[PDB]
Short mmCIF file of C-alpha atoms in Angstrom, two decimals:
data_model
loop_
_atom_site.label_atom_id
_atom_site.label_comp_id
_atom_site.label_asym_id
_atom_site.label_seq_id
_atom_site.Cartn_x
_atom_site.Cartn_y
_atom_site.Cartn_z
CA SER A 1 134.66 90.16 81.58
CA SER A 2 132.16 92.92 82.44
CA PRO A 3 128.89 92.34 84.35
CA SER A 4 125.92 93.21 82.17
CA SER A 5 122.16 93.12 82.35
CA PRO A 6 119.25 93.22 79.94
CA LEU A 7 116.93 96.15 80.44
CA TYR A 8 113.22 95.50 79.97
CA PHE A 9 111.12 98.23 78.43
CA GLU A 10 107.99 98.77 80.53
CA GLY A 11 106.58 101.92 78.88
CA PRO A 12 107.49 104.64 81.38
CA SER A 13 110.95 103.25 82.16
CA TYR A 14 113.26 100.25 81.87
CA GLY A 15 113.49 97.48 84.42
CA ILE A 16 116.59 95.63 85.59
CA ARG A 17 116.22 92.30 87.27
CA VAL A 18 117.93 91.90 90.69
CA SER A 19 117.61 89.08 93.23
CA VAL A 20 117.93 89.68 96.93
CA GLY A 21 118.82 87.50 99.90
CA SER A 22 119.69 83.92 100.76
CA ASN A 23 116.58 82.77 98.90
CA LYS A 24 117.25 84.95 95.86
CA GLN A 25 113.96 86.79 95.83
CA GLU A 26 113.44 88.19 92.36
CA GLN A 27 112.78 91.86 91.75
CA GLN A 28 112.42 94.03 88.68
CA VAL A 29 113.33 97.61 89.54
CA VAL A 30 113.70 100.82 87.54
CA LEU A 31 117.25 101.41 86.28
CA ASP A 32 117.73 105.06 87.33
CA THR A 33 120.78 107.18 86.57
CA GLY A 34 119.02 110.14 88.24
CA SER A 35 118.99 108.64 91.74
CA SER A 36 121.40 106.68 93.86
CA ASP A 37 119.63 104.28 96.19
CA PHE A 38 118.53 100.69 95.70
CA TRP A 39 115.12 100.00 97.19
CA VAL A 40 112.59 97.21 96.96
CA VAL A 41 108.92 96.79 97.78
CA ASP A 42 108.30 94.83 100.97
CA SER A 43 105.97 91.86 100.56
CA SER A 44 103.71 93.43 103.25
CA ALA A 45 103.95 97.00 101.92
CA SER A 46 100.96 99.28 101.69
CA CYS A 47 100.62 100.43 98.10
CA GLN A 48 98.92 103.83 98.15
CA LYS A 49 97.94 103.64 94.44
CA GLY A 50 97.00 100.35 92.78
CA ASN A 51 99.20 97.27 92.78
CA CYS A 52 102.86 98.06 93.55
CA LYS A 53 103.79 94.38 93.86
CA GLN A 54 103.73 93.28 90.21
CA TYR A 55 107.50 93.72 89.74
CA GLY A 56 108.45 91.58 92.69
CA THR A 57 108.55 91.96 96.41
CA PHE A 58 110.99 91.33 99.20
CA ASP A 59 110.25 89.47 102.42
CA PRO A 60 113.14 90.23 104.80
CA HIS A 61 112.02 87.47 107.19
CA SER A 62 112.81 84.68 104.72
CA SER A 63 116.36 85.78 103.93
CA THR A 64 118.80 84.31 106.45
CA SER A 65 121.44 86.86 105.38
CA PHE A 66 119.27 90.00 105.70
CA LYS A 67 120.06 92.42 108.51
CA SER A 68 118.10 95.55 109.20
CA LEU A 69 120.11 98.68 109.79
CA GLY A 70 117.20 100.27 111.68
CA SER A 71 117.56 103.65 110.02
CA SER A 72 114.67 105.46 108.31
CA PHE A 73 114.34 105.73 104.53
CA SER A 74 111.87 108.22 103.19
CA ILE A 75 111.46 110.18 100.03
CA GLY A 76 108.78 112.74 99.22
CA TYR A 77 107.17 113.47 95.88
CA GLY A 78 105.76 116.74 94.50
CA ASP A 79 102.18 115.46 94.97
CA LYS A 80 103.06 115.28 98.72
CA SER A 81 102.93 111.47 98.79
CA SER A 82 105.99 109.46 99.77
CA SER A 83 107.86 106.19 99.91
CA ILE A 84 108.86 105.08 103.39
CA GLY A 85 110.84 102.16 104.67
CA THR A 86 113.90 101.00 106.59
CA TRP A 87 117.48 100.50 105.48
CA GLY A 88 118.95 97.03 105.57
CA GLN A 89 121.71 94.99 103.98
CA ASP A 90 121.87 91.68 102.17
CA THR A 91 123.45 89.84 99.26
CA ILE A 92 122.34 91.17 95.87
CA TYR A 93 122.52 89.41 92.52
CA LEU A 94 122.74 91.54 89.38
CA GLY A 95 124.60 91.66 86.08
CA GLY A 96 125.56 87.97 86.39
CA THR A 97 127.51 88.69 89.57
CA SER A 98 126.77 89.23 93.28
CA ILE A 99 127.76 91.62 96.03
CA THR A 100 127.59 91.01 99.77
CA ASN A 101 126.38 93.22 102.55
CA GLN A 102 124.93 95.82 100.25
CA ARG A 103 122.84 98.53 101.79
CA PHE A 104 119.35 99.00 100.34
CA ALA A 105 115.95 100.16 101.55
CA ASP A 106 112.99 97.88 102.18
CA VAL A 107 109.95 100.03 101.48
CA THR A 108 106.78 99.44 103.49
CA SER A 109 104.58 102.18 102.05
CA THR A 110 104.74 103.77 98.63
CA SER A 111 102.77 105.75 96.09
CA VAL A 112 104.80 104.44 93.13
CA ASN A 113 104.57 101.11 91.35
CA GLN A 114 108.01 99.63 91.45
CA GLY A 115 111.32 99.73 93.31
CA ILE A 116 114.40 101.48 91.94
CA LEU A 117 118.05 100.66 91.26
CA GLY A 118 119.67 104.10 91.59
CA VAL A 119 123.09 103.99 89.96
CA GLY A 120 123.88 107.69 90.32
CA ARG A 121 126.59 109.45 92.27
CA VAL A 122 126.92 109.10 95.99
CA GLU A 123 126.03 112.79 96.26
CA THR A 124 122.36 112.15 95.35
CA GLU A 125 121.79 109.39 97.92
CA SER A 126 118.88 109.94 100.27
CA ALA A 127 121.14 109.23 103.23
CA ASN A 128 123.38 111.07 105.63
CA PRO A 129 126.16 110.15 106.12
CA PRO A 130 126.94 108.84 102.62
CA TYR A 131 127.25 105.13 102.03
CA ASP A 132 128.45 102.74 99.32
CA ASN A 133 125.67 102.37 96.75
CA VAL A 134 125.61 99.59 94.18
CA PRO A 135 128.16 100.97 91.69
CA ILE A 136 130.62 101.73 94.50
CA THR A 137 130.24 98.23 95.95
CA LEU A 138 130.69 96.56 92.54
CA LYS A 139 134.08 98.26 92.32
CA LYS A 140 135.04 97.69 95.98
CA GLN A 141 134.28 93.98 95.78
CA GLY A 142 136.36 93.61 92.63
CA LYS A 143 133.56 92.97 90.15
CA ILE A 144 134.55 95.99 88.03
CA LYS A 145 137.77 98.03 87.99
CA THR A 146 136.20 101.47 87.45
CA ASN A 147 132.94 102.89 88.81
CA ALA A 148 131.44 103.40 85.36
CA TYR A 149 128.76 101.86 83.20
CA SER A 150 127.43 102.04 79.66
CA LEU A 151 123.78 102.46 78.74
CA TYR A 152 122.14 101.11 75.56
CA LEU A 153 118.40 101.51 75.88
CA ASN A 154 118.12 100.32 72.24
CA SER A 155 115.51 101.21 69.64
CA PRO A 156 111.88 102.07 70.30
CA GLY A 157 110.35 98.55 70.13
CA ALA A 158 113.60 96.59 70.70
CA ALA A 159 113.38 93.28 72.69
CA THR A 160 115.64 94.71 75.48
CA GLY A 161 118.31 97.25 76.12
CA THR A 162 121.54 96.62 78.02
CA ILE A 163 123.61 98.11 80.84
CA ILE A 164 127.24 97.08 81.10
CA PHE A 165 128.93 97.69 84.45
CA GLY A 166 132.59 98.64 84.05
CA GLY A 167 132.61 98.10 80.28
CA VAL A 168 131.71 99.66 76.93
CA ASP A 169 130.37 97.95 73.80
CA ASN A 170 132.28 99.76 71.07
CA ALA A 171 130.11 98.04 68.36
CA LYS A 172 126.99 99.93 69.41
CA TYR A 173 127.74 103.47 68.32
CA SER A 174 128.82 105.42 65.24
CA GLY A 175 131.77 107.81 65.26
CA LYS A 176 133.74 108.50 68.42
CA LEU A 177 132.54 108.62 72.04
CA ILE A 178 132.89 112.27 73.01
CA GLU A 179 133.76 112.87 76.68
CA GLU A 180 131.88 115.61 78.57
CA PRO A 181 132.66 116.85 82.05
CA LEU A 182 129.90 116.88 84.65
CA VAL A 183 128.37 120.30 85.31
CA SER A 184 126.58 119.46 88.60
CA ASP A 185 128.13 118.81 91.98
CA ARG A 186 125.59 115.98 92.48
CA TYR A 187 123.89 114.79 89.28
CA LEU A 188 125.14 113.03 86.17
CA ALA A 189 124.56 116.23 84.21
CA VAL A 190 126.29 117.60 81.10
CA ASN A 191 126.05 120.98 79.34
CA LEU A 192 123.48 121.18 76.59
CA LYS A 193 124.71 123.76 74.05
CA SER A 194 121.80 123.92 71.63
CA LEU A 195 118.67 122.14 70.36
CA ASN A 196 117.69 122.14 66.69
CA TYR A 197 114.12 120.85 66.65
CA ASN A 198 113.18 120.20 63.03
CA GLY A 199 115.00 123.33 61.85
CA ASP A 200 113.96 125.53 64.78
CA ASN A 201 117.20 126.21 66.60
CA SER A 202 117.28 127.28 70.24
CA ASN A 203 120.37 128.13 72.19
CA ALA A 204 120.58 126.29 75.50
CA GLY A 205 123.66 126.76 77.70
CA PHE A 206 122.62 124.85 80.78
CA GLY A 207 123.14 121.50 82.40
CA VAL A 208 120.84 118.55 81.77
CA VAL A 209 120.64 115.40 83.88
CA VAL A 210 121.10 112.35 81.71
CA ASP A 211 118.31 110.39 83.42
CA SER A 212 117.31 106.85 82.50
CA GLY A 213 114.55 106.80 85.09
CA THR A 214 112.46 109.52 83.37
CA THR A 215 110.18 108.72 80.42
CA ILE A 216 110.47 112.05 78.55
CA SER A 217 112.61 115.20 78.71
CA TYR A 218 112.26 118.46 80.67
CA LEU A 219 113.78 121.76 79.58
CA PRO A 220 113.39 125.35 80.84
CA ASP A 221 110.56 127.64 79.73
CA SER A 222 113.21 129.66 77.86
CA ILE A 223 113.31 126.81 75.39
CA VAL A 224 109.96 125.02 75.53
CA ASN A 225 107.56 127.99 75.49
CA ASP A 226 108.58 129.35 72.05
CA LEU A 227 109.36 126.02 70.60
CA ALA A 228 105.83 124.80 71.51
CA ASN A 229 104.36 127.36 69.00
CA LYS A 230 106.52 126.20 66.06
CA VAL A 231 105.81 122.52 66.54
CA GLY A 232 102.09 122.61 67.51
CA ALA A 233 102.41 121.74 71.22
CA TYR A 234 99.74 123.26 73.46
CA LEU A 235 99.06 123.49 77.18
CA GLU A 236 96.00 121.74 78.65
CA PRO A 237 94.96 121.08 82.26
CA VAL A 238 95.75 117.67 83.75
CA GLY A 239 94.34 118.14 87.28
CA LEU A 240 94.31 119.04 90.02
CA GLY A 241 95.64 122.45 88.97
CA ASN A 242 98.55 121.15 86.85
CA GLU A 243 99.04 121.54 83.08
CA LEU A 244 101.16 119.79 80.47
CA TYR A 245 102.05 120.36 76.84
CA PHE A 246 100.05 118.16 74.52
CA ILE A 247 100.58 117.35 70.83
CA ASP A 248 98.57 115.78 67.95
CA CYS A 249 98.72 111.97 68.38
CA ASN A 250 98.50 111.35 64.60
CA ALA A 251 100.69 113.90 62.71
CA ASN A 252 103.32 112.66 60.22
CA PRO A 253 106.30 112.22 62.54
CA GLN A 254 108.63 113.70 59.89
CA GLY A 255 111.94 115.27 60.97
CA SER A 256 114.39 115.05 63.87
CA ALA A 257 115.65 117.10 66.74
CA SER A 258 119.39 117.33 67.25
CA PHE A 259 120.90 117.95 70.65
CA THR A 260 124.35 119.51 70.59
CA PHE A 261 126.61 119.17 73.64
CA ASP A 262 130.13 120.43 74.16
CA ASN A 263 133.20 119.29 72.27
CA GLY A 264 131.33 118.52 69.07
CA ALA A 265 128.96 115.86 70.46
CA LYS A 266 125.58 115.71 68.72
CA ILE A 267 122.70 113.29 69.14
CA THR A 268 119.87 113.07 66.63
CA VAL A 269 116.41 111.95 67.83
CA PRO A 270 113.44 111.21 65.53
CA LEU A 271 110.37 113.42 66.12
CA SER A 272 108.27 110.30 66.90
CA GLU A 273 110.05 110.36 70.31
CA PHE A 274 108.20 113.62 71.08
CA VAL A 275 104.66 112.19 70.81
CA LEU A 276 103.90 110.05 73.89
CA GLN A 277 100.61 108.15 74.24
CA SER A 278 98.81 109.29 77.44
CA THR A 279 95.60 108.65 79.43
CA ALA A 280 94.24 108.19 76.06
CA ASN A 281 92.84 109.84 72.98
CA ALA A 282 95.55 112.33 74.03
CA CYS A 283 99.36 112.43 73.54
CA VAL A 284 101.73 114.57 75.60
CA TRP A 285 104.69 116.33 74.08
CA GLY A 286 108.04 114.62 74.76
CA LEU A 287 109.41 117.92 75.96
CA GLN A 288 107.92 119.51 79.05
CA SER A 289 108.90 122.50 81.26
CA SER A 290 111.42 121.76 83.94
CA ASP A 291 110.29 125.02 85.55
CA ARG A 292 106.62 124.02 85.75
CA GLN A 293 107.48 120.43 86.82
CA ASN A 294 109.95 121.76 89.42
CA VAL A 295 112.82 119.52 88.31
CA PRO A 296 116.29 120.21 86.99
CA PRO A 297 116.47 120.00 83.22
CA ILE A 298 116.49 116.35 82.16
CA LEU A 299 117.09 114.26 79.06
CA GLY A 300 115.10 111.10 79.58
CA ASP A 301 114.44 107.84 77.82
CA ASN A 302 113.11 109.44 74.64
CA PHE A 303 116.50 110.99 74.11
CA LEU A 304 118.57 108.15 75.58
CA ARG A 305 117.23 105.53 73.17
CA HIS A 306 119.25 107.37 70.47
CA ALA A 307 122.55 107.61 72.31
CA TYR A 308 125.20 105.27 73.51
CA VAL A 309 126.22 106.73 76.88
CA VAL A 310 129.18 105.93 79.10
CA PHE A 311 128.79 107.25 82.65
CA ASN A 312 132.14 107.41 84.43
CA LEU A 313 131.55 108.15 88.11
CA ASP A 314 135.28 107.93 89.01
CA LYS A 315 136.43 110.36 86.30
CA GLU A 316 133.23 112.44 86.60
CA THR A 317 132.44 112.31 82.89
CA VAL A 318 129.63 111.29 80.60
CA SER A 319 130.62 110.24 77.07
CA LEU A 320 128.15 110.34 74.19
CA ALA A 321 127.85 108.95 70.69
CA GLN A 322 125.06 108.36 68.22
CA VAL A 323 123.71 104.88 68.82
CA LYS A 324 124.06 102.06 66.34
CA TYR A 325 121.42 99.40 66.78
CA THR A 326 123.09 96.01 66.32
CA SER A 327 123.37 92.51 67.80
CA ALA A 328 127.14 92.83 67.13
CA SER A 329 129.06 93.11 70.36
CA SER A 330 132.63 94.12 71.24
CA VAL A 331 132.95 94.87 74.93
CA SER A 332 136.06 96.41 76.55
CA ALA A 333 136.75 97.44 80.16
CA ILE A 334 136.48 101.12 80.93
#
């Protein structure tokens, strides 16, 4: 069989449930294909913004199997805040299986709200030298045969999505899975050929990270600035000195945007995915500028809900097909 996990829609992202340690301390962490480290919120962490302990915490002192590695973990954000902690190792429970002596960070101060299960490539680890992250360890410990996984975020408003480690549910897409090579030396990124947004076609020709950890999608100014005029998206300040594209919260969400990749792959996304409720009476556009946001171009959850995606970290491919929402299941090993 193939390990698999429900994914719980939270709004900004999807959570995966993982337990840590001899006492199986329960966490819910963001399933993130755009990063590569597993980290948890320490029970004594200092949350810099609000309550960062609503999705579980980890107390290293109560796990008899925990060992600290003593090395620093830190990651910085654009707002110049950070998450800081210490690397350790313990037994982890996920996908119906368990792995021993897995390295992860225990975070003791953070400006975000939740820990993260990074399932990306070893090349995007925040660590030097590289180490075996969760997908690598699942393979090494014989829980999966290939370092690969399939992502089914499911429909907007579905009960859960699913991740399958080492397997593919061939019931959950239409047509054929089309294999794309990676176009980054570090990210799970594929070439975006073109975007037809409700009849307005733009040529692309650049790599996009296929990123489950990101709520919406980020494309270069070369695409978003003209498209914003055709669709009624408009820049407004968001403080302190930043701006985003906004859009009418209440327009008829008629039409779709199609994303064309190489080798004939095409994913169609309803325009409702491009109106996101914000700090309210206001909705942000589901496309934003990767240039302004200072990120690589990204297709996030608003896109991913409409694709079935197989990430193959051994072969260095991402395969895509139009999703088919169904309780039917036929899972095969990758």
